[PDB]
Design a protein around this nucleic acid. Structure first.
Ligand SMILES: [Mg+2]
Ligand SMILES: [Mg+2]
Ligand SMILES: [Mg+2]
Ligand SMILES: [Mg+2]
Ligand SMILES: [Mg+2]
Ligand SMILES: [Mg+2]
Ligand SMILES: [Mg+2]
Ligand SMILES: [Mg+2]
Ligand SMILES: [Mg+2]
Ligand SMILES: [Mg+2]
Ligand SMILES: [Mg+2]
Ligand SMILES: [Mg+2]
Ligand SMILES: [Mg+2]
Ligand SMILES: [Mg+2]
Ligand SMILES: [Mg+2]
Ligand SMILES: [Mg+2]
Ligand SMILES: [Mg+2]
Ligand SMILES: [Mg+2]
Ligand SMILES: [Mg+2]
Lengths: 129, 218, 88
RNA sequence: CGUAAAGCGCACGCAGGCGGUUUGUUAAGUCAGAUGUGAAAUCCCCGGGCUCAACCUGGGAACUGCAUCUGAUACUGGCAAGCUUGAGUCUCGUAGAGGGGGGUAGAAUUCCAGGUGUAGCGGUGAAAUGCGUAGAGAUCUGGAGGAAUACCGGUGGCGAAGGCGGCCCCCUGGACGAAGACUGACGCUCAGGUGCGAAAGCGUGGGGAGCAAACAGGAUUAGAUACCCUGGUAGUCCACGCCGUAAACGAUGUCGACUUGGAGGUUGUGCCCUUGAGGCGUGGCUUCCGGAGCUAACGCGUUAAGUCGACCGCCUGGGGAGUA
């Protein structure tokens, strides 16, 4: 029963790439907009909106390039049934460093590559190949 | 721009889910293909046809469904390229090297009947030879003058003549074609939306093709 | 079963006004009233296990609603349960 | 974990696990820093010494740990105040073999009594046992009983599953739709537990037409303790208990999200001209075919066996054995 909204976001994007849908519309949340902000800034998603009032239905705009969708893969890691909190150096690189891994830290939600500069780590949210 | 006649789409309920961009709903319980998206498509496709025609590349105009075959044969012999209006023998491209001797056979035999052995063996034999001749003349006649491999395989349909597409798609051959609502724009590159079962439609598209290719020899 | 008028009365006794109907106390009241009205139907028949099952459903429903109510506010909870006639 | 071993038969549900959204706080987890410790050897690295090596050995790193201390505060947890999209209650209806209790009707089989009437009837592959001039079978009338409900009836409906069909009343459960109203995360799952659970069976008291284990006879057969025939008891039926199992099977746990189509079925409602047995929409349940993808393959395919999440159950070669 909708136990994990984040994994739901990731899977909306995943099925949105498989079906090659344009926009993906989902209920919003602070963490939602943070993660979508990370993916956006990194370039996985072309823009987004948090259009909505009392029920913010934020929609993402999926990216494509040649024929294949941009998102190679996007597995949820720190699931609610198994939280994962990597140490600073312990922070994993995805695809030898050419694929960011969204990690939540005390300074906010950010890429692991940035958390290597921030000198600190935290809960790793999701690998984005 | 609707240049002349009617060719909006047709079929009915069983539209291929892949062609969502190019469909609408007619009150006659049948889809009408958009012309707005269609115009740049066949425009640019004809442009490519002119570019490869200047490249002096061999083209194949594939056709079937009886009434369309005539339009096809007319659009090649009136032009200069090649055509397969009748039965499209499986593996005539990716298996082309045996078809090659099939053609050698056609040519040498049609030569044999026109001056050589016209009845030498038996009257019955002459009958059989004329028969088989006509068979190979209408089976692989349009590709007789080739001897190489087509630079482009323009097809009169997609979903019906699927094997031509899948075959010519196995190698470096562009395969732009006029496709109907139920057709798959998968193996096809430059898709050209528009109805297909109508004769005016195939005469229109194929004729435009005749123009653009006819400019390639200049 | 429980008549529509019965509910019309019960609401105007466990809520704000006739307009309201969704509050916890009202729901619990309803559940209990219905259950009590059903006690009879199972005095006989007894083999009626499907109806029975509907009952069990509304019963556990009631225990959940009551549990919530308690955790939310033990005060008025004690009032409700002391009035509705239950508890061990 | 559909078919190879493997989803409990189904449900309810305590502890446990997990949990929508906004704000505040706290800082438990988490993270950063610092200090203390983490015996020596051993392992690793760079040197040194035995003629080399083994071995010895100096320094270093390592000892993935633990604890206190000052910070961070995104994410999770606790406490606080909330929000409405989850869940729930209310209002109006709709369909239904949902269930329990009480009635009731028609066709038929069997039995019983009598009429008419006459030698076969019955059965099978054939036949015999069986019934029959003590008058059967056929036939008509009157009666008595028990059981199941042709037609409708449909991959149609309802139920959690088992399962439920003549019609009628009585008590009663759940599902769905419409426009709202209100509650404010009350949710999901669930070991142990509790309930329900075909048939057969068991107990007690009834009932007993048909049917039919056991049994008997006749055949068939090398034999036939079976198949087939003639009989026929328990049982099948009712009341109340017990049993607790099925290939309890979409061989497919439950809940939630997402992801192209087509033809249907069934049941609501909105809309349009009912302007003519229609047209365009929106929900629920359900059958078949198929796309991407998945799959060992077969196949599944928006009621997934796809893409994910939560929780539970179970599997770890065949046999012994689901036995002691
Ligand atoms: Mg198995
Ligand atoms: Mg099951
Ligand atoms: Mg709990
Ligand atoms: Mg939360
Ligand atoms: Mg702390
Ligand atoms: Mg040491
Ligand atoms: Mg040395
Ligand atoms: Mg050191
Ligand atoms: Mg907090
Ligand atoms: Mg908090
Ligand atoms: Mg309200
Ligand atoms: Mg259990
Ligand atoms: Mg029984
Ligand atoms: Mg008995
Ligand atoms: Mg029992
Ligand atoms: Mg079993
Ligand atoms: Mg099973
Ligand atoms: Mg299928
Ligand atoms: Mg045993």
């Amino acid at each position: 029963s909708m136990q994990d909204p984040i994994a739901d976001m990731l899977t909306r994007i995943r099925n949105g790439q498989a079906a090659n849908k344009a926009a993906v519309t989902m209920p919003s949340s602070k963490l939602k907009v943070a993660i979508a902000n990370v993916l956006k800034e990194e370039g996985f998603i072309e823009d987004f909106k948090v259009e909505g009032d009392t029920k913010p239905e934020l929609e993402l705009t999926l990216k494509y390039f040649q024929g294949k969708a941009v998102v190679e893969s996007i597995q949820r890691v720190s699931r609610p049934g198994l939280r994962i909190y990597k140490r600073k150096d312990e922070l994993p690189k995805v695809m030898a460093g050419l694929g960011i891994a969204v990690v939540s830290t005390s300074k906010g939600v950010m890429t692991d590559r940035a958390a290597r500069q921030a000198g600190l780590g935290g809960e790793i949210i999701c690998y984005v190949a | 721009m609707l240049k002349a006649g009617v060719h909006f789409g047709h079929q009915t309920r069983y539209w291929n889910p892949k062609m969502k961009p190019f469909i609408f709903g007619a009150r006659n319980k049948v889809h009408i293909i958009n012309l707005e998206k269609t115009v740049p498509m066949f425009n640019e496709a004809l442009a490519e046809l002119n570019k490869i025609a200047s490249r002096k590349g061999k083209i194949l105009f594939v056709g079937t469904k009886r009434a369309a075959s005539e339009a096809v044969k007319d659009a090649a012999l009136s032009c200069d390229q090649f055509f397969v209006n009748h039965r499209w023998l499986g593996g005539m491209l990716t298996n082309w090297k045996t078809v090659r001797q099939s053609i050698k056979r056609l040519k040498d035999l049609e030569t044999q009947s026109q001056d050589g052995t016209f009845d030498k063996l038996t009257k019955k034999e002459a009958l059989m030879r004329t028969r088989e001749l006509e068979k190979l003349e209408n089976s692989l006649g349009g590709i007789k003058d080739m001897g190489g491999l087509p630079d482009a395989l323009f097809v009169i349909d997609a979903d019906h003549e699927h094997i031509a597409i899948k075959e010519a798609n196995n190698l470096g051959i562009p395969v732009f074609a006029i496709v109907d609502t139920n057709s798959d724009p998968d193996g096809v590159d430059f898709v050209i939306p528009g109805n297909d079962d109508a004769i005016r439609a195939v005469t229109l598209y194929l004729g435009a093709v005749a123009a653009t290719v006819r400019e390639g020899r200049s | 079963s429980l008549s529509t008028e019965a509910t019309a009365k019960i609401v105007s006794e466990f809520g704000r006004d006739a307009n309201d109907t969704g509050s916890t106390e009202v729901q619990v009241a309803l559940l209990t009233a219905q259950i009590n009205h059903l006690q009879g139907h199972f005095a006989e028949h007894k083999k009626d296990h499907h109806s029975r099952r509907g009952l069990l459903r509304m019963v556990s429903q009631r225990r959940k609603l009551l549990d919530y109510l308690k955790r939310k506010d033990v005060a008025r909870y004690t009032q409700l349960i002391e009035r509705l006639g239950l508890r061990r």
